[PDB]
C-alpha cells in the first residue's frame, strides 16, 4: 500500500480486467489482445474534486500511467516502444474513462467516505 509511488496529489487505480478495445488494423486488434497483460491492469489521476474535467483526466491520466509504468518499471528492465506504449495508451485510457467516472460519482453521491 503506498502514497501512489511518490506522485503530487495524484492517486493509483486500483487493478482492472483490462477492456477489449478495437484498433481498425488486424495486426494491432491481434498485437493488442496476445499482449495486454503486458501493459498495467491500473491507472493514475488526480482528485476530480479540484476539476473533474473529462479531458484533462484522460490527457493526463495516460500520461502519467505511461510515465510511473515507464519510470518504476524501466528502472528493472521495461522500455515500452511507441508501437507497445500505443496499446498501453489504449487500456489504460479505456480503464481511465471509468475512473474518471467514478471519482466524479463518488464525489457526487458516495462524498462521504461512507
Given at each position: 500500500g503506498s502514497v501512489v509511488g511518490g506522485l503530487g496529489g495524484?492517486?493509483?487505480g486500483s487493478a482492472m480486467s483490462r477492456p477489449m478495445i478495437h484498433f481498425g488494423n488486424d495486426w494491432e486488434?491481434?498485437?493488442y489482445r496476445e499482449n495486454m497483460y503486458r501493459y498495467?491492469?491500473?491507472v493514475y489521476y488526480r482528485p476530480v474534486d479540484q476539476?473533474?474535467?473529462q479531458n484533462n483526466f484522460v490527457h493526463?491520466?495516460?500520461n502519467i500511467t505511461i510515465k510511473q509504468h515507464t519510470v518504476?518499471?524501466?528502472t528493472k528492465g521495461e522500455n515500452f516502444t511507441e508501437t507497445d506504449v500505443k496499446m498501453m495508451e489504449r487500456v489504460?485510457?479505456?480503464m481511465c474513462v471509468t475512473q474518471y467516472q467514478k471519482e466524479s460519482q463518488a464525489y457526487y453521491?458516495?462524498?462521504r467516505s461512507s
Open positions: 495524484y492517486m493509483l486488434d491481434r498485437y498495467p491492469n491500473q476539476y473533474s474535467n493526463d491520466c495516460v518504476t518499471t524501466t489504460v485510457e479505456q453521491d458516495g462524498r
